[PDB]
Amino acid sequence: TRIGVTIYKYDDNFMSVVRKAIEKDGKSAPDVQLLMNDSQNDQSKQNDQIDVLLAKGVKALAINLVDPAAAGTVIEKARGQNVPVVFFNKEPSRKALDSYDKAYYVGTDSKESGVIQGDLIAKHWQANQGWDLNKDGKIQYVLLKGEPGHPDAEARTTYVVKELNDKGIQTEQLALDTAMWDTAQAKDKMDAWLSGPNANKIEVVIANNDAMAMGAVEALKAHNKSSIPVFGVDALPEALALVKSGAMAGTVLNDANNQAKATFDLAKNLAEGKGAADGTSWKIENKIVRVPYVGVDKDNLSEFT
């Protein structure tokens, strides 16, 4: 039973955790062979890789899209051989998922991590009045965003601020830009902000993920401004270490193990012509599985590392 798998780019920290977990599942299944592909952050490369997989005769595809909007294209490729597709990590439109009897998605409730992140920030903000550098009762923040259009970048960005505001904490956006989930790009964007006229007004750094938080931490260090708190999402090992050291104030566990597990289980079942959830406890709703996030910081760090 051969299963084709595309990872939008191996360079991506969190998808690295997910990929290795999926591979472990594959190694362990004596009956399954995974054909692993690095799409190198290029959807056209991914589309070509999918053609090759289907030419080689896979029984299922597990696809981590470069561009969420290419779901329809990928589905139409898979339809040619009636191959099931389990999309994961970047959610297609409901319209695209609904276009095929055998298109599934494994992910998260995107808004949830923004809400959890906003609650962590609110908690530390209240506990650390010194953070309010200009004493106006508001958080002056900058935000490092994920890929524009990515449902998680959009949700995390919207809901982190909405949650703070709903909890009665007013906020002011000094700047926002995308660092595309990437550590190095984030370092450069944070560097620029620390080198501009608004430098000394920045009170909190909000990042849509840990990789970008990590870039900001490096930049803060280069500028002698490590007193500015940094929040992320994912709970990468490296980020958990920064939480322990106080170089990050909080993050959110993105459950790579269960997302990898559900992706593999559904793909394998569908490869065999079985119901997607056969022999599992997954709750599939309109062909979608979602795995909870959990907040992590100094106060509960012990439960994760």
Ligand SMILES: OC[C@@H](O)CO[C@@H]1O[C@H](CO)[C@H](O)[C@H](O)[C@H]1O
């Ligand atoms: O909601 C699906 C969840 O797996 C998305 O996770 C994010 O996925 C991004 C790439 O799609 C990137 O890996 C980032 O660090 C992750 O937080």
Ligand SMILES: [Ca+2]
């Ligand atoms: Ca302030």
Ligand code: NA
């Ligand atoms: Na195997």
